[PDB]
Amino acid sequence: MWFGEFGGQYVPETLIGPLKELEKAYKRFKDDEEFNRQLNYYLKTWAGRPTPLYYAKRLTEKIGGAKVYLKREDLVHGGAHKTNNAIGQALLAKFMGKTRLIAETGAGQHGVATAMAGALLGMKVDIYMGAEDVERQKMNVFRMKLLGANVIPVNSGSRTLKDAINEALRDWVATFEYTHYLIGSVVGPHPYPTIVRDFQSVIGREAKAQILEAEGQLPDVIVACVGGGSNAMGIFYPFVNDKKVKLVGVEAGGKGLESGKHSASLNAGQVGVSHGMLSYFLQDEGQIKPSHSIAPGLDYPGVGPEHAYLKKIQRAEYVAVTDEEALKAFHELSRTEGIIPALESAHAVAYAMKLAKEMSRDEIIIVNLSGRGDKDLDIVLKVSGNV
Amino acid sequence: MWFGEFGGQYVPETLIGPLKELEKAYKRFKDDEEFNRQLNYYLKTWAGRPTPLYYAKRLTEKIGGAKVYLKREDLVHGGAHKTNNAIGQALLAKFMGKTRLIAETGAGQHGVATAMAGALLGMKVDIYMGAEDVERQKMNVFRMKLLGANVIPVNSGSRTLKDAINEALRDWVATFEYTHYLIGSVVGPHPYPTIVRDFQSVIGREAKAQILEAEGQLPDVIVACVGGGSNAMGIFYPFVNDKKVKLVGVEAGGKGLESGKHSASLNAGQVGVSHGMLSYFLQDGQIKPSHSIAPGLDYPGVGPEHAYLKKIQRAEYVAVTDEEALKAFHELSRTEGIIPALESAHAVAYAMKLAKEMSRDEIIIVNLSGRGDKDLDIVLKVS
Ligand SMILES: N[C@@H](Cc1c[nH]c2ccccc12)C(=O)O
Ligand SMILES: N[C@@H](Cc1c[nH]c2ccccc12)C(=O)O
Numbered sequence: 001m002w003f004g005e006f007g008g009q010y011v012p013e014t015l016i017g018p019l020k021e022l023e024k025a026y027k028r029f030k031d032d033e034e035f036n037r038q039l040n041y042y043l044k045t046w047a048g049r050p051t052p053l054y055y056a057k058r059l060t061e062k063i064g065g066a067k068v069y070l071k072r073e074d075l076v077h078g079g080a081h082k083t084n085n086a087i088g089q090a091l092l093a094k095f096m097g098k099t100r101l102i103a104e105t106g107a108g109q110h111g112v113a114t115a116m117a118g119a120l121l122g123m124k125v126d127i128y129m130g131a132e133d134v135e136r137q138k139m140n141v142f143r144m145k146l147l148g149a150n151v152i153p154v155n156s157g158s159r160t161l162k163d164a165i166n167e168a169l170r171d172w173v174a175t176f177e178y179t180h181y182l183i184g185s186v187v188g189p190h191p192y193p194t195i196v197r198d199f200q201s202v203i204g205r206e207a208k209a210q211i212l213e214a215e216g217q218l219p220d221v222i223v224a225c226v227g228g229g230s231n232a233m234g235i236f237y238p239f240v241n242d243k244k245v246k247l248v249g250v251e252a253g254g255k256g257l258e259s260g261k262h263s264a265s266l267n268a269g270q271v272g273v274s275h276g277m278l279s280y281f282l283q284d285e286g287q288i289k290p291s292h293s294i295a296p297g298l299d300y301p302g303v304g305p306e307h308a309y310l311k312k313i314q315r316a317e318y319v320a321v322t323d324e325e326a327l328k329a330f331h332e333l334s335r336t337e338g339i340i341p342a343l344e345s346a347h348a349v350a351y352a353m354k355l356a357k358e359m360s361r362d363e364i365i366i367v368n369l370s371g372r373g374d375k376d377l378d379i380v381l382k383v384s385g386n387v
Numbered sequence: 388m389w390f391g392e393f394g395g396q397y398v399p400e401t402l403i404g405p406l407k408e409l410e411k412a413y414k415r416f417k418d419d420e421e422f423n424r425q426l427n428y429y430l431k432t433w434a435g436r437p438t439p440l441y442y443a444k445r446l447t448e449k450i451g452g453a454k455v456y457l458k459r460e461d462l463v464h465g466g467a468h469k470t471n472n473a474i475g476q477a478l479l480a481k482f483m484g485k486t487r488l489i490a491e492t493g494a495g496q497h498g499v500a501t502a503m504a505g506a507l508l509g510m511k512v513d514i515y516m517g518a519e520d521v522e523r524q525k526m527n528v529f530r531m532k533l534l535g536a537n538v539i540p541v542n543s544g545s546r547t548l549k550d551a552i553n554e555a556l557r558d559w560v561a562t563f564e565y566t567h568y569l570i571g572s573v574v575g576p577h578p579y580p581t582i583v584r585d586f587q588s589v590i591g592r593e594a595k596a597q598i599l600e601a602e603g604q605l606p607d608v609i610v611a612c613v614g615g616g617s618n619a620m621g622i623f624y625p626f627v628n629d630k631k632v633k634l635v636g637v638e639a640g641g642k643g644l645e646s647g648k649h650s651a652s653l654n655a656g657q658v659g660v661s662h663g664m665l666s667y668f669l670q671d672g673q674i675k676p677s678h679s680i681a682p683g684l685d686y687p688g689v690g691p692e693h694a695y696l697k698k699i700q701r702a703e704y705v706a707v708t709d710e711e712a713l714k715a716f717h718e719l720s721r722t723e724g725i726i727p728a729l730e731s732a733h734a735v736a737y738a739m740k741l742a743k744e745m746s747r748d749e750i751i752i753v754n755l756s757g758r759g760d761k762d763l764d765i766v767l768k769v770s
């Protein structure tokens with residue numbers, strides 16, 4: 001339940017029963033031969049795993065530093081790493097005899113992934129989404145509707161991601177017997193941070209095998225963007241015991257760390273409790289304060305407790321990249337490698353480019369390209385302008 | 388050169404020189420050890436081949452007849468099969484010493500694939516696109532520019548795909564010494580129909596191996612959508628010599644075959660010469676306009692190798708309306724969690740009707756040629 005001082009089950013007593021049932025089911029099914037057969041089958045044939053590890057040769061040469069590989073989570077079904085978690089939890093839900101899935105979403109990407117997994121497995125899907133995010137993400141709302149999911153606008157509180165999570169928790173207490181609450185990052189009360197990390201760790205396991213095959217050795221650095229932290233945990237976790245491999249999580253620097261408009265919880269937040277977990281949050285008064293990022297998936301005031309832990313024990317380092325830096329990396333990757341990255345993933349690219357220039361040419365960097373940029377074209381069109 | 392009577396190389400003297408140079412280069416490089424090491428490496432690490440073969444279990448059980456499998460070309464980098472052709476030809480261009488790629492596009496999808504491949508190999512990319520299509524494909528135009536390509540609006544003639552092809556050809560005769568013309572389907576003069584089919588046949592070879600692993604046998608029917616015909620040939624070509632395997636191409640029925648608003652060249656068109664080849668074209672007489680809700684299927688002509696297959700009766704060709712493809716778009720999204728391209732939805736729509744007639748022991752493979760992210764704006768307006 002804890003990662004050092006972070007994690008826990010900071011929830012009302014009505015949630016402890018449901019969380020214990022989930023913890024017991026997961027402990028049984030995680031190593032069950034039939035569950036993993038079906039999971040791997042769906043990941044292979046429906047999601048398209050494994051994804052490749054791609055040597056960004058032009059980008060490497062242009063910077064003239066370390067070798068930059070991209071783990072291509074942009075190629076999984078739906079365009080983001082979120083699918084790995086959505087399938088895992090939706091299948092777990094089916095094996096527990098649940099008929100309905102609920103989920104929070106802010107950017108809409110998790111909402112879409114949950115709706116896809118729900119469609120696949122013949123399950124009912126309701127997505128809680130803050131009204132401000134509904135307005136901002138008209139196309140993802142439409143994807144969810146096409147996929148057969150029902151989107152429920154959340155009008156309470158700040159009308160955004162944190163409020164959707166709380167409304168989803170309120171639903172789950174009343175409906176847990178037939179409903180699984182499908183959380184979209186390594187956040188929330190135990191066992192969710194563990195379950196989501198476990199279902200994303202396939203990224204790192206593939207990456208480790210692919211890099212040893214491609215280069216005969218472990219990478220020097222692994223770089224991943226961090227919103228809540230699931231894609232980073234997925235690629236990090238199989239290298240945690242490899243002491244030589246530096247892990248770098250990249251948070252949303254927004255308009256700048258001193259601008260007050262960012263989502264860098266580990267960098268500038270404080271220890272706090274929200275959504276069932278003890279972790280780092282941006283807060284003023286005790287009030288969990290609004291976050292910002294040009295990348296909608298990084299727009300969350302908190303962070304997963306396992307990242308707080310890895311930062312505390314200094315196993316991983318955490319940095320911030322601004323909106324402008326990510327936007328330059330989005331354009332740069334597109335025209336240098338013909339890969340349009342997600343704006344979230346562009347933060348990790350942006351940092352990797354700075355980091356490669358310093359490092360030696362014999363050394364190796366893996367960047368987790370967590371998603372594709374199709375979803376972000378409207379945004380980039382507005383902000384970068386038509387060209 | 389030819390496929391039965393169809394195909395050929397009916398171009399002026401200014402095109403004979405570059406086309407012959409391309410045939411020699413293609414002969415040289417198609418089986419070269421170094422060329423294939425680079426191609427398979429790019430298809431694996433950058434494009435993400437192989438793509439899976441998916442058993443659509445809920446769709447199959449719902450319909451209650453044949454097992455429907457989907458060849459998941461929607462998962463290739465870029466979201467459509469065209470990437471296969473774009474990499475192969477762009478690589479060929481690099482091996483021939485070319486620094487520039489030109490290409491036609493109407494839907495924008497070949498334009499994006501060529502832009503991506505050009506970015507990948509460090510080549511200049513100019514995309515010829517009709518002004519009517521430039522106006523209807525804002526986001527694909529943005530994608531191309533984002534990928535470092537330039538988009539040259541074509542204002543001659545009907546301001547769409549056929550005219551853009553013509554302008555690229557006029558460019559290529561002037562610039563062939565350093566430019567490769569990257570054609571986007573199995574059309575145009577020899578050797579383009581052969582080259583494009585060869586670069587897409589990876590689809591069919593994977594699908595064959597995959598269905599043998601899953602089911603222990605070849606499929607009873609393969610169903611693919613047909614615009615120019617590159618995704619259909621890709622999946623058809625490895626099964627041509629397997630006599631038991633039925634091949635079904637699905638053209639755009641549009642507003643209806645009786646309506647005059649469709650792109651079913653094989654079904655309702657006449658034989659003629661255009662863009663240096665003998666094939667089927669919709670005719671008024673002269674070549675007339677085409678229409679489909681799926682922009683990728685919106686072309687009045689069709690590949691000569693499909694004309695050949697239709698004649699020998701090796702492959703059967705059918706049409707599916709806008710309405711029918713739309714219903715299949717929604718059905719596959721809701722039932723399987725896969726949002727198909729509207730082009731691909733034509734293939735799904737026909738495979739669904741066909742599955743109903745067939746038995747539960749029998750197998751259909753549908754080429755799911757692309758994903759539907761690009762079509763959401765169009766589907767939103769109709770919805
Ligand atoms: N906001 C993103 C990612 C996300 C989902 N759930 C979260 C919980 C915490 C942090 C981030 C997330 C999305 O909905 O796609
Ligand atoms: N119109 C589609 C497909 C296409 C490209 N070139 C073609 C030539 C003939 C027929 C169709 C095509 C596109 O541009 O993406």
Ligand code: NA
Nearest residue numbers: 263265300302
């Ligand atoms: Na955060």
Ligand code: NA
Nearest residue numbers: 650652686688
């Ligand atoms: Na046609």
